[PDB]
Design a protein around this ligand. Sequence first.
Ligand SMILES: CO[C@@H]1O[C@H](CO)[C@@H](S[C@H]2O[C@H](CO)[C@@H](S[C@H]3O[C@H](CO)[C@@H](S[C@@H]4O[C@H](CO)[C@@H](O)[C@H](O)[C@H]4O)[C@H](O)[C@H]3O)[C@H](O)[C@H]2O)[C@H](O)[C@H]1O
Ligand SMILES: OC[C@H]1O[C@H](S[C@H]2[C@H](O)[C@@H](O)[C@H](O)O[C@@H]2CO)[C@H](O)[C@@H](O)[C@@H]1O
Ligand SMILES: OC[C@H]1O[C@H](S[C@H]2[C@H](O)[C@@H](O)[C@H](O)O[C@@H]2CO)[C@H](O)[C@@H](O)[C@@H]1O
Ligand SMILES: [Ca+2]
Ligand SMILES: [Ca+2]
Ligand SMILES: [Ca+2]
Ligand SMILES: [Ca+2]
Length: 404
Amino acid sequence: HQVLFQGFNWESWKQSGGWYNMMMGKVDDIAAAGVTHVWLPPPSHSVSNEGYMPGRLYDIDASKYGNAAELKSLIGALHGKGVQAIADIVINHRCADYKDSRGIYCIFEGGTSDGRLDWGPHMICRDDTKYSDGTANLDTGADFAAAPDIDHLNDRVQRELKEWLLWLKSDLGFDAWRLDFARGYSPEMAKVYIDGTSPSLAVAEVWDNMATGGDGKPNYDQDAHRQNLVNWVDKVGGAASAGMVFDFTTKGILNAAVEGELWRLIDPQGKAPGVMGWWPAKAVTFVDNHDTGSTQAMWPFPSDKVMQGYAYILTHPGIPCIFYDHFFNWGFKDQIAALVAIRKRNGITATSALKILMHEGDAYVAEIDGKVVVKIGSRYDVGAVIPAGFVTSAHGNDYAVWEK
Ligand SMILES: CO[C@@H]1O[C@H](CO)[C@@H](S[C@H]2O[C@H](CO)[C@@H](S[C@H]3O[C@H](CO)[C@@H](S[C@@H]4O[C@H](CO)[C@@H](O)[C@H](O)[C@H]4O)[C@H](O)[C@H]3O)[C@H](O)[C@H]2O)[C@H](O)[C@H]1O
Ligand SMILES: OC[C@H]1O[C@H](S[C@H]2[C@H](O)[C@@H](O)[C@H](O)O[C@@H]2CO)[C@H](O)[C@@H](O)[C@@H]1O
Ligand SMILES: OC[C@H]1O[C@H](S[C@H]2[C@H](O)[C@@H](O)[C@H](O)O[C@@H]2CO)[C@H](O)[C@@H](O)[C@@H]1O
Ligand SMILES: [Ca+2]
Ligand SMILES: [Ca+2]
Ligand SMILES: [Ca+2]
Ligand SMILES: [Ca+2]
């Protein structure tokens, strides 16, 4: 049994009294909902309030989310309920606190009295000429324009970041990682940190653009997109590795599929069309996150069909990740809890068997592990396709779930 929960949104840093402190009052509901892992925001001091422009990595007390004490309390509380904590690891780039003799912000400060993470421009990818001194290695991945990109090929960088990561575990209590902008560096570099810090899991944000047709809608065939993701997992270590990926392929397809085009939810082989269909054990599914939904809304899920999104991921293979807003602010708390209960009660896991029974425009009906049947779509009657012995267990707007 494994169910992730993103414990924050793009507005969380603004929370009166501290986000982590507020979250203490949410722990019980999250645990009772069957959640096993809670993804928390970048914990270190960051130039940007949301934390995605970290500077002093060890300076937890400078976070807009709360200080080290408050964070440890939250993680302690989650652990008290058997829930693990995933830290949002942002290491592709990093902001330098001080200027060098060139007037360039490239003198880093780790947050401790010694030289830990006290890097200089030699640790900045040389091809990031806005900050580099030309002495480092070339970036192993894409660049983040607003800040120095870190040369992960640098020996000291690997050593110290790994030491820091282990510190997040031993000192704060974190159990696993969420790798931010993993396209910023190679899967080989991700391998170094994953293999070197033994997290329970390391879900990477490998976000590639999804191919679309002349009408702007994603193509039915998204194999190129999920193949990239499968390849990333293979290169990071495959099955043996704790590494995994957010199922963006499923996210893009599902975004479109619910708009009366549920025929998109199956490939020519009869499997789920996203990563879920090729490597479910490595596919972390989701309806929306702080980037796609929330106040950034880069790729929101049709707001009137969100619960269909959850009926889908919460009953299917792959590791579903619930979004904070949907659970506490949209009023789906009880329905989402009930869907997880169904998943758990039936022993459904990321690798459960998926047998799709119907995949028409306004009706998708699938059977998981021969124990749970789920349906989404505007078509009301699908009773003819419901296997014998199944009885409705949960239902809502354009979705229903049966149990046997
Ligand atoms: C008005 O608001 C609406 O609320 C609705 C209920 O939540 C949903 S419909 C939603 O859930 C439905 C199940 O409650 C299914 S219909 C689905 O399941 C049915 C029950 O197993 C069967 S059989 C059922 O038998 C009744 C007694 O014999 C009979 O009177 C009914 O006509 C018959 O449905 C049915 O065959 C099967 O299709 C929907 O598919 C789900 O979408 C609305 O979405 C929501 O707007
Ligand atoms: O199932 C785990 C398996 O996943 C892939 S093999 C994958 C291939 O990438 C895809 O093009 C083809 O259509 O389906 C197969 C099976 O899902 C990975 O490469 C491999 O290491 C892993 O064992
Ligand atoms: O905003 C349009 C949308 O509004 C609700 S969905 C959702 C809303 O987006 C969110 O800001 C708020 O926190 O929760 C509501 C649901 O409780 C409406 O249900 C939907 O039909 C409409 O399209
Ligand atoms: Ca220092
Ligand atoms: Ca950069
Ligand atoms: Ca980003
Ligand atoms: Ca980079």
